[PDB]
Design a protein around this ligand. Sequence first.
Ligand SMILES: CC(=O)SCCNC(=O)CCNC(=O)[C@H](O)C(C)(C)COP(=O)(O)OP(=O)(O)OC[C@H]1O[C@@H](n2cnc3c(N)ncnc32)[C@H](O)[C@@H]1OP(=O)(O)O
Ligand SMILES: CC(=O)SCCNC(=O)CCNC(=O)[C@H](O)C(C)(C)COP(=O)(O)OP(=O)(O)OC[C@H]1O[C@@H](n2cnc3c(N)ncnc32)[C@H](O)[C@@H]1OP(=O)(O)O
Ligand SMILES: O=S(=O)(O)CCCN1CCN(CCO)CC1
Ligand SMILES: O=S(=O)(O)CCCN1CCN(CCO)CC1
Ligand SMILES: CC(=O)N[C@@H]1[C@@H](O)[C@H](O)[C@@H](CO)O[C@H]1O
Ligand SMILES: CC(=O)N[C@@H]1[C@@H](O)[C@H](O)[C@@H](CO)O[C@H]1O
Lengths: 317, 317
Amino acid sequence: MEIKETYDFSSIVDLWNKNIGTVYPMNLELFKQNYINDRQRKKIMGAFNGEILIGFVIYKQWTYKSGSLKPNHKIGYINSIIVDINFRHQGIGTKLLDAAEEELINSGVKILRCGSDTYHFFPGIPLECLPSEEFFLVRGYKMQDYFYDLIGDVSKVDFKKPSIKDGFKVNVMKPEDRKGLFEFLEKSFSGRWLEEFIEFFQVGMKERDIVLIKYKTSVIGFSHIYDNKSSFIGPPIYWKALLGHNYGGLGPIGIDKTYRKQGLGRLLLYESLQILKKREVKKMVIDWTEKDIINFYGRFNFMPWKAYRKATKEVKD
Amino acid sequence: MEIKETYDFSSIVDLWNKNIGTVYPMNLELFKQNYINDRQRKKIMGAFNGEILIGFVIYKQWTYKSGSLKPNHKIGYINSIIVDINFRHQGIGTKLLDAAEEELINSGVKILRCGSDTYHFFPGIPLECLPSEEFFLVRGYKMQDYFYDLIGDVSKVDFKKPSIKDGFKVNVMKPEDRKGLFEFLEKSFSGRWLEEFIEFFQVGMKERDIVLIKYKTSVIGFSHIYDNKSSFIGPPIYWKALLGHNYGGLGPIGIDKTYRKQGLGRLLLYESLQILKKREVKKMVIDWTEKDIINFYGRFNFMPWKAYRKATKEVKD
Ligand SMILES: CC(=O)SCCNC(=O)CCNC(=O)[C@H](O)C(C)(C)COP(=O)(O)OP(=O)(O)OC[C@H]1O[C@@H](n2cnc3c(N)ncnc32)[C@H](O)[C@@H]1OP(=O)(O)O
Ligand SMILES: CC(=O)SCCNC(=O)CCNC(=O)[C@H](O)C(C)(C)COP(=O)(O)OP(=O)(O)OC[C@H]1O[C@@H](n2cnc3c(N)ncnc32)[C@H](O)[C@@H]1OP(=O)(O)O
Ligand SMILES: O=S(=O)(O)CCCN1CCN(CCO)CC1
Ligand SMILES: O=S(=O)(O)CCCN1CCN(CCO)CC1
Ligand SMILES: CC(=O)N[C@@H]1[C@@H](O)[C@H](O)[C@@H](CO)O[C@H]1O
Ligand SMILES: CC(=O)N[C@@H]1[C@@H](O)[C@H](O)[C@@H](CO)O[C@H]1O
């Protein structure tokens, strides 16, 4: 058995699907999109029996800015690790993660996170991979709180328009709105979401995918929406194979702090969903939510669908 | 708004699907199977706006034996409660559960359980219904541990036959095995599983659905298996709409205590799965498992799919 780098994406994807594809169906388009476009220091290590891939780990170090947030080389990520089902409990996962962690640690990492990376597949350890929590515990990862993807079928329900407030309007973005959108994100959401806007527009996101809420002429909020015409495969539609025909998704969604708790997020969400409904969307996902916000979406008939556990290892000095 | 009994199953099923059907798709066949065949004291209460059903609760008291286990009138169950999405936070769920609980309490109930009933839909409060945990907490239910349904696609993986032990053979049940199966269940699994065998054979379970493990001529274990030819819709295939073509399922599965921790459960599981694989089963479910046993099935490529929280209210004296 040898551990070495591999970029045989077809082999990786086939191993992914055989092992966890029932609940996380992967396609090469998504895999290559997210791996190749990532700007961080990154690597894929495989375990091989001769020519045959039997396991892999994908790992990264935070070396590229996220919007106004400078990179922190102390942070590393385990994007994904899978050992083939016919080769478990032979120490292969330990060998792959030892290789990954040692490389990270030598390059300055002090905090190792499970998922949650840029161009992630997972916000954290999936509930479907609950048994892996013990694997990570043995290595010194600590298990923390949960995040949830939510699912709803917007074709099935009609909602009341929230009572509008004068001056506030919600519309799909136009090209001429970009300046104002970026000024808004620099003020209000200047970290990962700013970076995501910059990056996703480079990899095929279009104005039709963004909804803006304005007070007079000023952008005060946004949402990202997805349907089966989106070119960029973002997190809400990673798992679109599970979602049937006319899938869709929403997220992120944000309102300027000084405008919060006035009904404007509800208005933004309502209008965004109406856009998707009119686009003939059926099942759709809201990704990577915290427990305390679920009921905001639950009012629109969304339910927790997938759960992920945050987990972090502090490198011993 | 009025609360009264309703047995308009089509209306109930339509409300179920509109509200939670994305993740718990209900069909009338299953609904009627499980409601009508249940032997406990049972009722369905609906909330109505005139002729229109806007919510329901299904509830039961333990009044009929489970195998050798006598009924305990102190135990009541909330089988399911759903308020329509357009009528939430108006007190309707409180009114339905107040009606149910008061009836139960007057008839002697001291312990109220969320799900886990005979002919249940849910082992406990589904993770997809996590927000309802707060609804039940306000009423004095306490949240306990979790159970999991597991999912696997048996068409995708080949396993090694476990090393057989002489004298032990695994085969689909024949009609002439029934006596020995029931003597075995009376000795080893004489509660709910015994009752389920008795009842499920009345409602369409067939010998082809049962696998037996024998030591010489003596039954020492069994499993229940399901495919798209099963007549009885048991828990592993409740949610078969999510499972695609050639769905299946397994559970329960049990070995005589004195024969445990010798490899025989693994052998039983392997052979049961080989039966399903040869029947051309693809995605299949193992229902209502405890965390400590997941890895037993995980070796065969099964992963947690759905999670449910046990919850119980102790009636204040
Ligand atoms: C950020 C993320 O990627 S989260 C998703 C993680 N990946 C998955 O869950 C995919 C499915 N699972 C797998 O691919 C594997 O089970 C892995 C990668 C978790 C572990 O790979 P393996 O090669 O089997 O692990 P390895 O043999 O090195 O395990 C070492 C120790 O970890 C612990 N461990 C590993 N798997 C488990 C498990 N399922 N349950 C409990 N402990 C375990 C044990 O202590 C084990 O030692 P043991 O064999 O003496 O019991
Ligand atoms: C055994 C089982 O059936 S488990 C599955 C339970 N059912 C579901 O989850 C289906 C989907 N949900 C529903 O149908 C509803 O949300 C129900 C049945 C849980 C509650 O119905 P409602 O009519 O909205 O509840 P009702 O208005 O009586 O709620 C009373 C109090 O419960 C608490 N509560 C109810 N819903 C929630 C929620 N989503 N989050 C937090 N607390 C809540 C609140 O304290 C609420 O008072 P409030 O309105 O002042 O905040
Ligand atoms: O772009 S910003 O980093 O300034 C704003 C980030 C806000 N959210 C990031 C991801 N989480 C995940 C949980 O929903 C919530 C907060
Ligand atoms: O039929 S018996 O009641 O004697 C045996 C019951 C055994 N199991 C019942 C249901 N649970 C649920 C968790 O898997 C496990 C124990
Ligand atoms: C509902 C929501 O806003 N969720 C977003 C998610 O869409 C996004 O993929 C992630 C990472 O940027 O940040 C979460 O907070
Ligand atoms: C894997 C397993 O045995 N799970 C069974 C389940 O199949 C059955 O529906 C339930 C209620 O009898 O009891 C569980 O213990």
